[PDB]
Design a protein around this nucleic acid. Structure first.
Ligand SMILES: [Mg+2]
Lengths: 1150, 57, 193, 62, 64
DNA sequence: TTTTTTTTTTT
DNA sequence: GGAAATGTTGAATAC
DNA sequence: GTATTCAACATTTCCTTTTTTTTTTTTTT
């Protein structure tokens, strides 16, 4: 046993001579402390080339953080405020986790400083004990010996129980001869289940007063069985685990510990950071679907009278649930939740009903019809009946079924959020389970336990609005199982995107060190949205600077000095070679008739696939022939999209025939390797190729795919100088730890094909992550809102996989994904410093134009990628501009559809206080800031970024379809949003308005900025607010008093006005049967009243018009409404004093 | 009148079929019929040649 | 998932000599049989009725021996007392012999032994929390009601006394509040009635 | 129930266990397990449902 | 229910069963019934019944 | 005080 | 019942 | 295990791509 006192005389100031990569990380984290403070989280993307010391740099950083903890604990032990700072190493694959942990232990054991060992044996034993590995529970159980788990069973008295020992005996008996595979899957399943049950048993044994005291051998065996216990004890603080395990959490003896809830102060090294986007997405897609009708009915029924204890431990928790109870009661009253729900009329059995909605706009329903929702009190049923509406008019009146589903979703997510808030108020994580259980048991809501547990780790125009913080919802309405007269609305949600999860980790306080060569690829399908992360994290999103990038570039050049050593990179772009393929086919089958027939019959190619196969086969064979005829290249790797395994044996024989023909012609024996699969590499190790190149003479062709050659696989081989000739040279300026190895020297790159994420697994049957793609593209601006909504519709209606690909192809996100594949392919093939004197790169010619447009900063590119790009370009439409157009339309249609909902809610009496507050907030924001200099956070979708500062032209029917808005110079002649078009200058010249505006802080003019209000805001809100403020400004100085119109008829009239000395209630409207209906509505509640219709601007000479309740002209004494046509003169901004005096003269005649 | 009707064999009786009913009902009215699968291409786009053929007939 | 599980079971079955292998195969086979019958009962429940005839019909009748009884092709069954009390599956659902005992002839060997077997089956029911049960019943029966259609005739009248009893019970015992012990250490020893 | 035929064999028994709820130290559950009938009640129910039962055992009437 | 136990004895036995009870003490309670003796004779009657399954017998069969 | 070995089925 | 114009299967013939 | 004639419904085109063309993974249950 070792103790921390071994480091008492350790020199913490002596470090190994740092690489430029280590210095870059250290400098960036130093600057982070200066800028963001000590307790701030951070995200540092590190575009390090793998194969030039990436893993060593990450593990050396991890070791330095380990020694900082030891130094801090030695120095500050007297303080007592122990903070065992957690360090995580996560990556997506199990083998990479294991390999990284092994390499860290090796680094501890073998690191030297100034030719002397870094650590003594006791120091090594201490550090290696701080590191823990957390696999899945099945593999965790199968690692433990029978001695350890028998010790655990004895110490916790579970050995007496019949079923426990029966299952453990069965698992042991399987474990003796688990060599067979099917035995291995069965053993894995039972091992997982048994580990679950057993850990449950120690957890209930430990929570109570019968807590088994753990020490000595029992403690060691428990820590071996539950490595998470070492983290709880404070004996270990470094954890190696996968991303899926990190999201799911790991057990200790006390509970399950979730790292996401305790990220404050953690340091989290994520390898292959941009792969983790779709890993997190797949973890989020696996949530359990749940029925909204049952959920809302249970919530309504149980929140009606159940309540908590009213004790000090439940302070302020009932107040959290108080608004939700009121909302549930109102919802159940409105939608008649006393009745169940059913479908009436159109046959739901032939097809259920699918509803798609992103919770903001772009709503799509699989039903052609307007599904409405009716409560029949003659029966006792809520009927989803089908008006015969057509699918084409999706912009018709909003039906009731969608409204019901949206409100039910809002209430359900509100319940889950209130549960989170109440758990935090009840209390730092052992309290979580108890809080959830006590709250759910007091409310009799124990059925929501799994939902709260699963979701816990994961007024809108006035908020920063984004899809990544909001997500999407897809609800299918179908008959209940076993019944034919009740319907359920099962809903599947994404409440956040993986970018939202990563930004939440950074906000919680984690310092995240994301390492990948393509960590900043400009795609959102295949990467995190770094436009969103930069908006949300600000400068907590760290970035290595130009000087640091130059230093890293120089360091990479010093280790890969191709030019000073004579290594040449040759690039060819191959198109189809139809005559060459035809000659080869006619040689393959000499006595057949035609090469088309040979393709069809002997190769087995249908008439549809002939052209495609002739295209991709000719290029592959031409590259192979050019490889074989080369004098001294020895190692090719084809990267296709399909695997050439036994399912395509007829093509492999032809390819083998051609390879043998060319091996004879050029007199070098070439050993092919077909079907290098994931399975092949699991079964037959990749070192078979390595051993072949180590021992045999001649060339080697390897057929693989992009998908097969993932991260972590090392295709380098051990060099035998007797076989290499003199073609190997060392490109590193200083070489150490000789171990001569080399790598690939020819490569064929096919154009990557199926680039939309599609796992085709069981959990992908709901197509949720196929809507996430369209909605993430629309967030970026890669799609117009029209295109995104249409693609969402076709995805609801059932879409061919081919057609989704075609929709994806027309974005520039697509081309960035293609280049991200190509850049990762050639990057993984370059992992040593012994190189040929020539390296051949054969490229599909369909990749030429796509690679011709790589225009980012080449400071961190690999040499092969630079060569590919330069060769592509030498044979030679903006993306931000198209993004600007699309985001103009999207910010428009977002505000257009959200204002409509807000006004519809205000016209639904009573108007809720939050709605009135949001309305006032929007108007105040637009009045104060018509334009803003930087992209606003809190009101981001009142504005659009214009290509011209302070103004823009737009065309679009403000009460028609929001998909058909156009914008900047695509529309030369149309409407225009500017300071002039709202007549603000005329308004501000008035001697009464201007003091009011300067006092209120409203803008007297528009700043010439890039962010200007959207057309919906300008036309529908800004002008009305200007008119209201101008009218109030003038009339308040003529002894009128202004107070708010109450919630019964809010927004129908702008302000109640009260003049001194007149007691008749007066009302104001500022800018016929509908107006008379409003007249009747107000006078029904408040009796006889005066109503004023006034326009702030206009011709003051036109006379004042006096109308009755029916809006017919009459005498002033008999009039009920006065229509003042112009309060301020539009030519020179003088007050219309005559009109106001006539108005007050009428008011005296009341 | 263009009557998008179902396939003729799938209707078990003459009077069930819209075809042969409005044909005998409106004896002095120009009629034309179609099946609703016969306006999609293999990728699902509208088939314009069908609508030219219907109009010219 | 079906192919993966079935192939794993078949491979396990390929030797199956070891007793623990037999135990694992038994558990896996039971769970897989449950899942497979659940699925085929789903497809037979909906309009996508698979027409069983000939070789396929014989295959189902071999996989589901209770299907012969439903089809009227077999009418003599040999089964244990435990299986008799639990019932057996056909392509539609689970058939419980106890619910359809009219006209049946039943031969029970070692009849007096079956007293203890039936008792052991009755002992194995799942316990239920009465507080949660009564609170759920009271909460849901307060206003929820059924369709009022001819298929629901005279059914709400069956529940009307129970609703009244539930409301009076919840008023008398104040089921708005949850229950807790006071004073003597409940964790020291729980109360059994 | 005094106006009916009373017997243990068709009333059974009830065993209720009152304990703190799992994970909470301030809420109690009433976990009840029941016998709603005895095996003799089940057998008599089968006979009343119309089954003809042929019970064979050397000690059938012990 | 059968009348083998008085309600006094039955309630005492139920009380002792609730508070935890040794099997040897429950068995002692059972031994006082005549039901116990009927069960003993039932066990014995089956033991010799299951061993008499053929029609070839010795001249002497020993029952100890 | 009395003094043990057996079992089926779904989950 | 997309049309016309071309074209092939199956069926009856059948010598 | 026939050969020849022939009547009935398929198929392709049409003011001219159907469109793109796959393999891969962790964890709890
Ligand atoms: Mg016609």
């Amino acid at each position: 046993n070792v103790s921390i006192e071994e480091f008492t005389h350790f020199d913490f100031q002596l470090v190994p001579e740092p690489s430029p990569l280590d210095l870059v990380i250290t400098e960036s984290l130093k600057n982070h402390i200066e800028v963001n403070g000590v307790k701030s989280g951070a995200l540092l993307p590190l575009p390090f080339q793998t194969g030039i010391g990436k893993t060593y740099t990450a593990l050396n950083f991890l070791l330095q953080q380990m020694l900082e903890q030891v130094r801090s604990e030695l120095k500050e032990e007297n303080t007592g405020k122990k903070s065992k700072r957690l360090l995580y190493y996560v990556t997506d694959s199990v083998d990479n986790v294991v390999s990284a942990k092994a390499d860290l232990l090796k680094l501890i054991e073998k690191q030297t400083v100034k030719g002397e060992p870094r650590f003594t044996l006791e120091q090594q034993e201490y550090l290696k004990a701080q590191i823990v590995h957390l696999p899945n529970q099945s593999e965790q159980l199968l690692q433990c010996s029978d001695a350890v788990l028998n010790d655990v069973l004895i110490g916790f008295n579970l050995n007496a129980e019949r079923d426990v020992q029966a299952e453990w005996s069965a698992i042991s008996g399987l474990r003796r001869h688990a060599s067979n595979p099917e035995v291995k899957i069965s053993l894995n399943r039972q091992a997982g289940y048994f580990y679950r049950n057993l850990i449950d048993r120690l957890q209930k044994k430990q929570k109570g007063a019968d807590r088994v005291l753990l020490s000595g051998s029992l403690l060691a065996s428990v820590e071996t069985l539950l490595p998470g216990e070492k983290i709880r004890n404070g004996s270990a603080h470094v954890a190696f685990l996968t991303t899926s395990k990190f999201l799911k959490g790991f057990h200790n003896t006390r509970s399950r510990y979730s790292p996401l809830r305790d990220l404050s102060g953690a340091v989290l090294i994520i390898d292959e950071i941009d792969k983790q986007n779709q890993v997190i997405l797949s973890e989020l897609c696996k949530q359990q679907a749940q029925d909204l009708i049952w959920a809302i009915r249970t919530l309504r029924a149980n929140f009606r009278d159940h309540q908590l204890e009213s004790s000090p431990r439940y302070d302020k928790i009932e107040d959290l649930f108080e608004p939700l109870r009121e909302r549930l009661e109102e919802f159940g009253t409105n939608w008649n939740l006393a009745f169940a729900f059913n479908t009436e009329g159109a046959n739901l059995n032939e097809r259920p009903v699918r509803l798609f909605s992103d919770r903001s706009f772009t709503h799509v329903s699989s039903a052609t019809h307007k599904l409405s929702l009716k409560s029949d009190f003659l029966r006792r049923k809520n009927l989803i009946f089908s008006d015969e509406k057509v699918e084409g008019s999706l912009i018709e009146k909003h039906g009731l079924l969608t409204r019901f589903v949206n409100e039910a979703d809002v209430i359900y997510q509100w319940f889950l959020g209130t549960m989170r808030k109440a758990v935090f108020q009840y209390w730092l994580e052992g309290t979580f389970q108890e809080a959830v259980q006590s709250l759910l048991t007091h409310f009799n809501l124990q059925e929501f336990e799994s939902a709260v547990y699963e979701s816990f780790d994961t007024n809108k125009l006035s908020s920063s609005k984004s899809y990544h913080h909001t997500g999407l919802k897809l609800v299918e309405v179908a008959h209940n199982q076993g019944t034919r007269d009740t319907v359920n609305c099962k809903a599947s949600f994404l409440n956040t995107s993986p970018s939202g999860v990563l930004a939440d980790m950074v906000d919680a306080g984690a310092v995240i060190l994301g390492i990948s060569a393509t960590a900043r690829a400009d795609t959102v399908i295949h990467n995190f949205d770094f436009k969103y992360l930069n908006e949300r994290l600000g400068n907590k999103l760290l970035s290595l600077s130009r000087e640091q990038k130059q230093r890293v570039n120089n360091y990479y050049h010093s280790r890969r000095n191709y030019k000073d050593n004579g290594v040449v990179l040759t690039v060819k772009y191959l198109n189809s070679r139809d005559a060459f393929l035809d000659a080869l086919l006619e040689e393959y089958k000499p006595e057949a008739r035609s090469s088309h027939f040979i393709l069809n019959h002997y190769l087995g190619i249908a008439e549809s696939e002939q052209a495609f196969v002739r295209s991709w086969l000719s290029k592959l064979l031409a590259s192979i022939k050019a490889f074989i005829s080369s004098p001294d290249n020895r190692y090719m790797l084809s990267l296709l999209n399909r695997t050439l395994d036994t399912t395509r044996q007829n093509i492999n024989d032809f390819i083998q025939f051609c390879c043998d023909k060319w091996a004879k012609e050029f007199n070098v024996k070439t050993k092919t390797f077909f079907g290098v699969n994931a399975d092949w590499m699991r079964l037959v190790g990749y070192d078979e190729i390595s051993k072949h190149l180590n021992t045999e003479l001649g060339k080697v062709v390897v057929f693989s795919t992009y998908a097969s050659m993932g991260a972590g696989k090392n295709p380098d081989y051990a060099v035998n100088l007797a076989l290499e000739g003199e073609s190997l040279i060392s490109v590193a300026d200083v070489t150490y730890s000789t171990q001569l190895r080399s790598d690939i020297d020819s490569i064929y790159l096919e154009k990557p094909t199926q680039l939309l994420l599609s796992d085709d697994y069981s959990h992908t049957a709901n197509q949720l992550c196929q809507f996430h793609q369209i909605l993430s593209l629309q967030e970026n601006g890669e799609l117009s809102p029209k295109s995104a909504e249409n693609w969402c519709r076709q995805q609801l209606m059932g879409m061919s996989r081919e057609r989704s690909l075609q929709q994806y192809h027309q974005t520039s996100d697509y081309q960035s994904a293609v280049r991200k594949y190509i850049e990762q392919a050639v990057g993984r093939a370059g992992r040593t410093s012994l190189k040929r004197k020539q390296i051949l790169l054969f490229v599909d010619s369909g990749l030429k134009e796509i690679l011709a447009e790589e225009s980012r900063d080449p400071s961190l590119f690999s040499h092969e990628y630079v060569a590919l790009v330069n060769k592509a370009k030498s044979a030679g439409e903006d993306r931000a501009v198209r993004r600007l157009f699309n985001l103009a339309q999207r910010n428009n249609k977002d505000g257009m559809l959200s204002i409509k909902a807000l006004v519809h809610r205000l016209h639904n009496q009573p108007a809720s206080k939050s709605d009135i507050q949001e309305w006032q907030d929007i108007r105040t924001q637009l009045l104060r800031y018509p334009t803003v200099a930087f992209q606003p956070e809190r009101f981001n979708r009142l504005y659009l970024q214009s290509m011209t500062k302070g103004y823009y032209r737009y065309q679009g029917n403000l009460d028609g379809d929001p998909n058909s808005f156009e914008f900047f110079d695509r529309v030369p002649y149309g409407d225009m949003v500017s300071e002039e078009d709202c007549s603000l200058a005329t308004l501000v010249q008035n001697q009464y308005v201007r003091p009011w505006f300067e006092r209120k802080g409203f803008a007297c003019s528009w700043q010439k900025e890039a962010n200007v209000m959207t057309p919906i805001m300008f036309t529908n809100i800004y002008k009305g607010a200007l008119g209201e403020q101008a009218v109030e400004a003038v009339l308040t100085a003529f002894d009128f008093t202004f107070e708010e119109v109450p919630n019964s008829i809010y927004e129908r009239f702008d302000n109640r006005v009260i003049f001194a000395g007149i007691e008749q209630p007066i009302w104001l409207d500022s800018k016929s049967e509908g107006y008379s209906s409003k007249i009747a509505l107000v006078e029904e509640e408040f009796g006889p009243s005066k109503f004023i219709y006034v326009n702030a601007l206009g011709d003051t000479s036109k006379p004042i018009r006096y109308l009755n309740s029916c809006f017919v002209e009459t005498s002033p004494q008999l009039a009920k409404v006065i229509e003042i046509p112009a309060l301020i003169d539009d030519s020179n901004a003088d007050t219309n004093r005559t009109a106001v005096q006539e108005l007050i003269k009428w008011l005296h005649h009341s | 009148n263009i009557l998008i009707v179902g396939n003729k064999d799938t209707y078990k009786s003459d009077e069930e079929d819209p075809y042969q009913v409005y044909r005998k009902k409106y004896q002095d009215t120009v009629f034309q019929s179609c099946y609703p699968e016969r306006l999609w291409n293999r990728q699902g786009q509208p088939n314009r040649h069908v609508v030219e053929v219907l109009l010219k007939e």
